[PDB]
Amino acid sequence: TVTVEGIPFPAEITFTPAVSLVGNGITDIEIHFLQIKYNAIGIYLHSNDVLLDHLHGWKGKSADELLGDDSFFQALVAAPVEKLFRVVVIKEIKGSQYGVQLESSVRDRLVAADKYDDDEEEALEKITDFFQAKYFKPGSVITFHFPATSAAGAVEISFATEGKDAAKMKVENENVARMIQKWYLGGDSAVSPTTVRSMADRFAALLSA
């Protein structure tokens, strides 16, 4: 177990497999010299040899070298491995506020690669409508499940607030999926650089022995 801002995070989220925690951090912002800690993020990954193969070209590098190498994080996004994003809400916000932030971030990454048409638009609409109904209480846990291959499942976006049961939603438009993946696992472009620095120190270890 590992605590982030007093929020416990499991070392391994099995029963999903064997995804292991590789990065920890928070989503924050500074408005008028004041830190606003929104979320607590934990990135889980399955440590198969497929990962150590797709990341072998970065073996022996340092955390400061992986951090400046935005291609290492793109190769990490493009790994065919079960992934899990565990975002725990810290500050009470409307679920729509996180929805318009997920849309605008993914839409911009979609327009950059020209991969924005109508198939991506509806898959983005199904996500915004999913979050605008729920309200983020300090304890709610959004969960992104990225299976290893497109054969097994698709992409499961789970919600877990205290009281009600786990509200889940499936998306299969892989364009929006691997842009949400870039939103959390990107280099200098990710939403939580604190989570990125944690992956750098972790991967720099495995990718050294």
28, exposed or middle or buried, with CB in 10 Å at 0-12, 13-18, 19+?
middle
Helices 119-131 and 174-185 pack at an angle, to 10 degrees, of: 60
Please report which residue ranges of 55-152 form alpha helices under DSSP H.
63-68, 70-77, 95-112, 119-131
Long-range contacts of residues 108-114, Cβ cutoff 8 Å, at least 24 apart: 109/179, 109/182, 109/183, 110/175, 110/176, 110/179
CATH domain 2-49+80-186 topology: Chalcone isomerase (3.50.70)
* Sequential DSSP letters for 118-137: SHHHHHHHHHHHHHTT-EE-
171 touches 155 (CB < 8 A): yes
User: Which technique?
Assistant: X-ray
What's the DSSP call for residue 116? -
CA nearest neighbour of 22 among 37, 10, 14: 10
Q: Give me the residue spans of the domains in the chain.
A: 2-49+80-186
Where are the strands (E) in the chain, listed by range?
2-4, 7-9, 12-13, 19-25, 28-30, 35-37, 39-46, 83-89, 93-94, 135-136, 141-146, 156-160, 167-170
* Resolution of the experimental model, in Å, one decimal: 3.2
Cα separation, 155 vs 145, whole angstroms: 6
Phi, psi of 65 (to 5 degrees): -80, -40
CA distance readout (Å), 31 to 28, 34, 36, 37, 208: 10, 5, 8, 11, 39
Take residue 86 and report the two structure tokens written for it.
């565990």
Cα separation, 140 vs 40, whole angstroms: 11
